[PDB]
Amino acid sequence: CDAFVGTWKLVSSENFDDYMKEVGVGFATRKVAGMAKPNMIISVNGDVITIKSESTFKNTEISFILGQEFDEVTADDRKVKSTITLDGGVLVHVQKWDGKSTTIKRKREDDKLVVECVMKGVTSTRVYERA
Numbered sequence: 001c002d003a004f005v006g007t008w009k010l011v012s013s014e015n016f017d018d019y020m021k022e023v024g025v026g027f028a029t030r031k032v033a034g035m036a037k038p039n040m041i042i043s044v045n046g047d048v049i050t051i052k053s054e055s056t057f058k059n060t061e062i063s064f065i066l067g068q069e070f071d072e073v074t075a076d077d078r079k080v081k082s083t084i085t086l087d088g089g090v091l092v093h094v095q096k097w098d099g100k101s102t103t104i105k106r107k108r109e110d111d112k113l114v115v116e117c118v119m120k121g122v123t124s125t126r127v128y129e130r131a
């Protein structure tokens with residue numbers, strides 16, 4: 001992926017609290033995480049893709065190669081096994097932990113970067129625009 005490269009600012013969020021609740025996130029974290037308006041910085045160097053998230057809540061970073069499972073510590077401190085692939089221009093990220101999973105799709109749509117986060121029956125949509 002590389003039409004994803006850039007700096008992106010959160011401009012809208014739907015159902016994020018519900019998503020965090022479903023994932024198992026404690027209330028105090030949800031309160032701070034849900035108010036935050038992160039920047040996401042995507043860069044690519046050969047086959048390594050780097051996704052940074054920066055906010056008043058927490059900074060995080062993952063670097064990965066498509067199709068290679070890796071250990072991820074999430075912003076809420078879950079230790080998950082993550083696999084990210086590129087599927088019709090959509091970055092498909094699955095996190096697996098304790099026999100559970102969540103799926104995070106990052107897609108380009110017009111000039112927006114759209115993030116869809118799915119946990120059980122909950123779907124949260126987060127839209128970012130170029131900073």
Ligand SMILES: O=C(CSc1nc(O)cc(C(F)(F)F)n1)N1CCCCC1
Nearest residue numbers: 020025033038074075076104115117126
């Ligand atoms: O606040 C964050 C990180 S910021 C973020 N922004 C998005 O648009 C999407 C996601 C993610 F990881 F849930 F997909 N996190 N935590 C994500 C994992 C669970 C608790 C909240």
